[PDB]
Amino acid sequence: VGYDDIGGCRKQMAQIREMVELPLRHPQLFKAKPPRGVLMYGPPGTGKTLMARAVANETGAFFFLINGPEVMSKMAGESESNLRKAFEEAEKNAPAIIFIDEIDSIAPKRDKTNGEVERRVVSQLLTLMDGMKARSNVVVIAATNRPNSIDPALRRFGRFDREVDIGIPDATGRLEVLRIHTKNMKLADDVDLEALAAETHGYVGADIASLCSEAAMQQIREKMDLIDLDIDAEVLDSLGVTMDNFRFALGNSNPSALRETVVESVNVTWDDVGGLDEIKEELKETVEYPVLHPDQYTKFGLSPSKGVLFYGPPGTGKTLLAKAVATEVSANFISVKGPELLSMWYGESESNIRDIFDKARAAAPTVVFLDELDSIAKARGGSLGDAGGASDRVVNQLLTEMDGMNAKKNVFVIGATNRPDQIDPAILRPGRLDQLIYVPLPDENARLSILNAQLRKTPLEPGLELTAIAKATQGFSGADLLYIVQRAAKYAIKDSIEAHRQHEAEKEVEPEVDPVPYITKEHFAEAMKTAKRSVSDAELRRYEAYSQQM
Amino acid sequence: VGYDDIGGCRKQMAQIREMVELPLRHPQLFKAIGIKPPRGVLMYGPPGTGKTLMARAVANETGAFFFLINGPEVMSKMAGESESNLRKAFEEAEKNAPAIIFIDEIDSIAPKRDKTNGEVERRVVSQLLTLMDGMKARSNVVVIAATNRPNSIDPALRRFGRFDREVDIGIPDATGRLEVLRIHTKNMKLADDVDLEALAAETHGYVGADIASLCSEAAMQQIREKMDLIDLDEDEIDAEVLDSLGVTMDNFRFALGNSNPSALRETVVESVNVTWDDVGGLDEIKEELKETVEYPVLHPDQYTKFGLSPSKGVLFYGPPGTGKTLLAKAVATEVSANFISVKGPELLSMWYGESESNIRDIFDKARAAAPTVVFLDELDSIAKARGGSLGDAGGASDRVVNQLLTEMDGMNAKKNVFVIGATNRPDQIDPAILRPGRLDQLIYVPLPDENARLSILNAQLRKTPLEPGLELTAIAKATQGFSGAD
Amino acid sequence: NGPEVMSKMAGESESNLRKAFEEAEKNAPAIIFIDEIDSIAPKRDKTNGEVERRVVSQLLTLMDGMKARSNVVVIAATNRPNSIDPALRRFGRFDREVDIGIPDATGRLEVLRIHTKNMKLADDVDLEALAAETHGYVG
Amino acid sequence: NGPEVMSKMAGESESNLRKAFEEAEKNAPAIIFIDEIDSIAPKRDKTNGEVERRVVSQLLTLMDGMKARSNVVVIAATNRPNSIDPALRRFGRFDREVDIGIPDATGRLEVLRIHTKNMKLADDVDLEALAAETHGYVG
């Protein structure tokens, strides 16, 4: 594993060569002073250990690995013996390079830890780092997964001067790592890595390797379950990973950051959302341009809106649009309902919102869906902070964590509320959640489109009409239309079951597909006798008043 | 045990079989494709589903040596001794042969490395991370882990290279329960009357060990019904009764009627004895409820043939005592699906967020042990119109109703959970809850008519001795505005 | 006993549990009685410490894991079953739950007869009237 | 004493109670006095900690259990009886709850006579009138 194995981090790699490689083989130009330690941080799985092994291999300097949590011992004070023996051997043998992995096990901030061996070893390590003659030129390599849990005493001049933020790669970096990992295996010709890198968004470093391995695994299963190979040279050499394997692996795999927040699959398409044509057009305009055409943003010089709020009467399709965005936008998506985050303990609520937004930034680009915002971002009001100011603290954390998203972050927040009156007006200020889409009640054509989209997978009578239903349902909603269709289906099922019962009765006393083949005129006629309007006129009046106020 | 003992999980069985067999059966094929296979898997799911059973089967079948690590077992009192235990285990496993590590109850060893405050714990987490990933991390070794709460694991452990694949050992389907029943009812002797297909059909939430318990209880009933005719026979038991036990279908029925799913053990409803004949009148309401509850659970082929979804919610409303709670009890006693009886204000709590936590737990249990029936008594107590309260406890009621809204309709699935509400004040219920798709059926239970009062009187006098010449038609004709309670 | 197992050293409560179970299993088919289990075995999700979670996991793996048990029966007693880890309320660990509830009139009569069988009672005693008039007595 | 037994380490307060009880039982028949028990043992269901639950369970097991006590008497003192675990207020743990309430006029008379026994008093003052005048004074 040489310098050519790590990819996607040319700039960050370039500093590493300058920081530790050039000043180690010639200290003359620096004297005509390089640090005695370099920190690397970033999300897990970013090639930290890979880079450390590549620098350890390419340079012939002696290498002495001390894994962080492996320096302690059971006997009295043998941890100190281990540490100073490591440093003395590193100095005495040669101008070596030492790599300390998982430093967090060695420097737990000295603020929460109340042990004694940890204090002794951290202070001794501080003294050792203090004692380093400029002529040896030995440097230490540190590797931390979480940078904020570090003893700040080490974060000072002379101790680990320059840090290097090994972040997530861009599209070009993802393509480069894809090539690096897939060059050894025999990849079939009918494959283009550019498309896989344009569709791969949150994967970092190791997840790409997982993707390739999974695709290969599926192909191996495809050529093992069917052939039933149960040694076979002809089977051995006839192995080639095609495009469908990579598509399947992409459809199955998930960024490691969003592993905990896996969402149940609800497959929706844009033809399922009947009506709302202009709303769908505006939503596409808002969401696909910032994520696919950065050149347009650069040319315009205007910051696109980074939020949107759906409001309207219940049963109009806010959650349906959220599902459609989650499924068919080609970007990450983390769904949250308001009350999930709150916790009885002190601090946990804010830690949870901070963690969720940290994950959102990690798997950038992302679409964080806040459903029913009327619970976590309620009006301040005169609640007196009876919960120790818990709600106030939660909303304050949400505001500070939503306003601190620059252009590079690329995190789009989707709002959806039934009652917009209880939303804190601070949220609706420009720069946080500026755009507000209003989802009105369907018109006759929208209702017809909804019915056609809901009856897509339903066997239906050839001699049937829906314009009558549309013309009849006047103040109805999408949920109401769903109720009509489900009731008609239930009547059809009842007829089918009773007909099958009768047929079996006089049979026991080849069957067709069913006694009742399709949804029928009479089924809809009887289903429409018990259809009642979902939302009354008072709510429509109040929503119209709110809309006109805007 | 063997691969023919684990039942109800075929996809996952193949997923672990692949990792355990192919890199130890056809290494040449993986050298030909070029890459190495994944070498880490995490088993997760509800307790008593078969993860540890699968680990045992793998240990028995694979011909390499197998090492088992219980979670807390590694830790010790001497400073830096757990680290030595982990290092010794991993090095011995690597040195001796290609092997399978099994980490049982990983939740004890990976407490998120961020919420913990013990130094030694974070030391053990970092040591495991180093052993599973780093310089010379692995040379032909694979690690399987088992957990019940995978979200309480450090994300650094849940990355490719350490734990590549997460297999979901979840609740089985009807076919899965049939397979489990056939597996567990092989060695025992059954009478011809037993029908395992019906047993699997009426079992609705039983998973693995639940089925095992059912079988054991049935056997216990057989032994405790066919020993009273004989004495204790403490010295010895004779062959004629030792043979011909024959666990009958009535024994299986009794054991199924006594038991409950392990998930709902905490919320078991007290037994109530009502019947459809106990509920007088309301013929249309009883038939509508019966068809709307029994159609999705008994006839799913028709629903999938039309490809639509069934109706879930229903709301009874009317004057008090008309028979709403009685209908709910009748459903609880008659319908085969599980029953979750919850009162209105039961789930509220003084703390912050614990009301919504309780609601989430109840609905998670309901969708876990599906098909399930959830009865929300007096919905107007917890689900009132939002914004009315001028002075509130930090808007806790609003948060509760929003939690109900999102859980009953949100980013979830339709696992056949039926919400029934019973309130006599439908004016206080928020309009959002009454939307179709959340509670679509609003059933009005009016005051009884002449024939309904007669039916009610006969229903209530079905177990009482009566005068031969007494007729109830006069009483019915004389009570005009009365209710069932009257 | 419930809190008898916990010690200040990190990793010693589970050692005590392991020693107890191995000693119980090494002998003839034995019975292990765990009194006041609400202390040893709370829900892991609701607790916030670490030693209790580790003890619960040790108990779980001892009760039902690879090489589960060998003719050893475990009995438990508690005043609150709802505050117990759901993984322990399972077949294999605690399959059967007996409900030792309040006695009825006949049960209370039996209790009176049992508790007044060794003392020097008078001739005037009718235990039936006492068992009738005592209503909510738990024994 | 109430809080004197509590500690910070896991499994130390229960060890203190065990040491106290075993030391008491090792010697001749003895009396134990748990002053201000309401601090040690509040209701289990209405507490958030874990050490308080463990020490409550330890008290329960110590006073009632297999081979509980032998010629050892336990006495308690508290000001808030209702804020105690109901499982503790049963026969075998605290058999009878004696109500040491305020005294009457005669009781106050004896209290005055007891307290004024060592100080030199003048003949004019009569303690009976003082006892009659005082109404709510206790001890």
Partner: peptide, 22 residues
């Protein structure tokens, strides 16, 4: 030789109260 020790004391919770207006 040295030795370690475990300790878990408590945390801090939050309550919610109800008020009456007029």
């Amino acid at each position: 030789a040295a030795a370690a020790a475990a300790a878990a004391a408590a945390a801090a919770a939050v309550a919610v109260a109800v008020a009456v207006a007029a």
